[PDB]
Structures are given as C-alpha cells and as structure tokens.
C-alpha cells in the first residue's frame, strides 16, 4: 500500500500534460520515439510533452503525448520507453524537499531506484540514484 515509503504527495493534478523539468542540469525529461530516454534543454522539442495518470493514489504512469510510449525502468535499472503499460511503467510520485517531485520505480521500490537526469542530460541507472541528489528532483511545468 505505502510500499515502505513516506506518503508526502505533491500538489497538482493530471488534468493536463506537463513537462518534467530536472533541477540538476535544467533538462526536460525526453522520451525518444526509438524507446530512448534522456533530457534536453530545448523547450521546442516535440518529445518532452508527458501526460501523467494515476493508477492508484500516489502511483503514476508517465506517457508521451507525442508517441504514446510509457516511461519505464528495466530489471537492470535502465530507463526506457515502453509501447505498452506493464509493471515496469508504474512510479511512486512523491513530494521531495517540500517542493519537488520524485519518481521511484514501483517494481524496484525497495531499492530506492528513481528517475533521474545527470547534468549532462543523460538518464541515471536505478542503482546510481539516491535520496539527496539533485538528479532526482523534478518540477512539473505546464506545456
């Protein structure tokens, strides 16, 4: 239910799409049509528009409005874009530092694997992410 994690939730809803802005390097979470996932500073990019949806309270899907691909994290902690929703597509959306949004792999929740962007714009691998990093901090902006 709580998945052994705090339950501080961020404000806001899923009514409209959003951009997931990463504090770390100022990148927007990007889901490439090829299943590639990274971050870009280009506000005009057509693959940064994401529609979040709540499966259950605090659990979301992050889907690309452009491609329809779901954000996901594999068994080895690699983030990728899935054509279909599966257990690797669910994330625990939580409030962080009383301000930001963090996304913890539900499948790998016990290991604290988050979605995160490096200063260079490249995704981090599950095991490389951790509480306290700027890489995991996101700001949902209107498109």
UniProtKB/Swiss-Prot annotation:
SUPFAM superfamilies: Cytokine. It is found in: Secreted; Cytoplasm; Cytoplasm, Cell cortex; Cytoplasm, Cytosol. Changing residue 122 to A: Decrease in LRRC59-binding. In the nucleus, phosphorylated by PKC/PRKCD. CDD domains: beta-trefoil_FGF1. Changing residue 124 to E: Loss of CSNK2A-, CSNK2B- and LRRC59-binding. Reduced integrin-binding. Defective in integrin-, heparin- and FGFR1-binding, and defective in inducing FGF1 signaling, cell proliferation and cell migration. InterPro entries: Fibroblast_GF_fam (IPR002209), IL1/FGF (IPR008996). GO terms for cellular component: cell cortex; cytoplasm; cytosol; extracellular matrix; extracellular region; extracellular space; nucleoplasm; nucleus. It comes from the Eukaryota. Predominantly expressed in kidney and brain. Detected at much lower levels in heart and skeletal muscle. SMART domains: FGF. Residues 118-134 are annotated as: Heparin-binding. GO terms for molecular function: fibroblast growth factor receptor binding; growth factor activity; heparin binding; integrin binding; S100 protein binding. Its main location: secreted. The keyword rRNA-binding does not apply. Heparin binds at residue 24. GO terms for biological process: activation of protein kinase B activity; anatomical structure morphogenesis; angiogenesis; branch elongation involved in ureteric bud branching; cellular response to heat; epithelial cell proliferation; fibroblast growth factor receptor signaling pathway; lung development. Changing residue 101 to A: No effect on integrin-binding. No effect on integrin- and heparin-binding, loss of FGFR1-binding, defective in inducing FGF1 signaling, cell proliferation and cell migration. Transmembrane segments: none annotated. Changing residue 118 to E: Reduced integrin-binding. Defective in integrin-, heparin- and FGFR1-binding, and defective in inducing FGF1 signaling, cell proliferation and cell migration. Plays an important role in the regulation of cell survival, cell division, angiogenesis, cell differentiation and cell migration. Functions as a potent mitogen in vitro. Acts as a ligand for FGFR1 and integrins. Binds to FGFR1 in the presence of heparin leading to FGFR1 dimerization and activation via sequential autophosphorylation on tyrosine residues which act as docking sites for interacting proteins, leading to the activation of several signaling cascades. Binds to integrin ITGAV:ITGB3. PANTHER family: FIBROBLAST GROWTH FACTOR. This is Fibroblast growth factor 1. It comes from Homo sapiens (Human). The gene is FGF1.
């Amino acid at each position: 239910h709580h998945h052994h994690h705090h339950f501080n939730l961020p404000p806001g809803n899923y009514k409209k799409p959003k951009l997931l802005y990463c504090s770390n390097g100022g990148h927007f979470l990007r889901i490439l049509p090829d299943g590639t996932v990274d971050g870009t500073r280009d506000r005009s990019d057509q693959h940064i528009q994401l529609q979040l949806s709540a499966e259950s309270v605090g659990e979301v899907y992050i889907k690309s409005t452009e491609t329809g691909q779901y954000l996901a994290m594999d068994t080895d902690g690699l983030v990728y874009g899935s054509q279909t929703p599966n257990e690797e597509c669910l994330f625990l959306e939580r409030l962080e530092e009383n301000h930001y949004n963090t996304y913890i792999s539900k499948k790998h929740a016990e290991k604290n694997w988050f979605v995160g962007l490096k200063k260079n714009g490249s995704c981090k691998r599950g095991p490389r992410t951790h509480y306290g990093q700027k890489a995991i901090l996101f700001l949902p902006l209107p498109v």
